[PDB]
Design a protein around this motif. Sequence first.
Motif, PDB file in Angstrom:
ATOM      1  N   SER A   1       0.852  -1.224   0.000  1.00 57.13           N
ATOM      2  CA  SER A   1       0.000   0.000   0.000  1.00 57.13           C
ATOM      3  C   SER A   1       0.875   1.257   0.000  1.00 57.13           C
ATOM      4  O   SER A   1       0.504   2.282  -0.538  1.00 57.13           O
ATOM      5  CB  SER A   1      -0.815  -0.084   1.292  1.00 57.13           C
ATOM      6  OG  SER A   1      -1.751  -1.148   1.189  1.00 57.13           O
ATOM      7  N   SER A   2       2.031   1.188   0.599  1.00 63.89           N
ATOM      8  CA  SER A   2       2.926   2.383   0.630  1.00 63.89           C
ATOM      9  C   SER A   2       4.392   1.948   0.579  1.00 63.89           C
ATOM     10  O   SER A   2       4.729   0.824   0.893  1.00 63.89           O
ATOM     11  CB  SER A   2       2.620   3.071   1.962  1.00 63.89           C
ATOM     12  OG  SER A   2       3.043   2.239   3.031  1.00 63.89           O
ATOM     13  N   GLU A   3       5.267   2.833   0.185  1.00 68.19           N
ATOM     14  CA  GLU A   3       6.711   2.471   0.116  1.00 68.19           C
ATOM     15  C   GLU A   3       7.245   2.160   1.517  1.00 68.19           C
ATOM     16  O   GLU A   3       8.010   1.236   1.711  1.00 68.19           O
ATOM     17  CB  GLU A   3       7.401   3.708  -0.468  1.00 68.19           C
ATOM     18  CG  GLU A   3       7.287   4.884   0.506  1.00 68.19           C
ATOM     19  CD  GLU A   3       7.824   6.152  -0.161  1.00 68.19           C
ATOM     20  OE1 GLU A   3       7.174   6.641  -1.071  1.00 68.19           O
ATOM     21  OE2 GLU A   3       8.877   6.613   0.249  1.00 68.19           O
TER      22      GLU A   3
ATOM     23  N   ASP B   1       1.878   9.782   8.677  1.00 66.25           N
ATOM     24  CA  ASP B   1       2.012   9.475   7.225  1.00 66.25           C
ATOM     25  C   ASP B   1       2.448   8.018   7.015  1.00 66.25           C
ATOM     26  O   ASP B   1       2.425   7.511   5.911  1.00 66.25           O
ATOM     27  CB  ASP B   1       3.087  10.435   6.716  1.00 66.25           C
ATOM     28  CG  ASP B   1       4.403  10.163   7.446  1.00 66.25           C
ATOM     29  OD1 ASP B   1       5.151   9.319   6.982  1.00 66.25           O
ATOM     30  OD2 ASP B   1       4.641  10.806   8.455  1.00 66.25           O
TER      31      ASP B   1
END
Length: 110
Positions: free
Chosen positions: A17-19, A46
Amino acid sequence: AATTLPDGAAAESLVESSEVAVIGFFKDVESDSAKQFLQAAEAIDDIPFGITSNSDVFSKYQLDKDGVVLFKKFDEGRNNFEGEVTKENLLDFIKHNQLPLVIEFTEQTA
């Protein structure tokens, strides 16, 4: 804040979903070692922090017991938190995991 992973199916989709993403493996999220996790996680928003106590998520990374590790796409890709679990330590692990070094200064010490 940390999300609630249902099983290993989310531990793999989360890193995608995210780095940058982290997932802890506490056997007793209702204990103290888990309290510091969320508190230290509230610092950053974040980052998709995740936490679960299921077993499919533990047997996945072969964890004989509880343990918190981070997940990233760059560098090695996996980590291994050690020492004791504490907000001050967590904020260090994260900052020490993502974001590689930087071409500046040279740590004038030795």
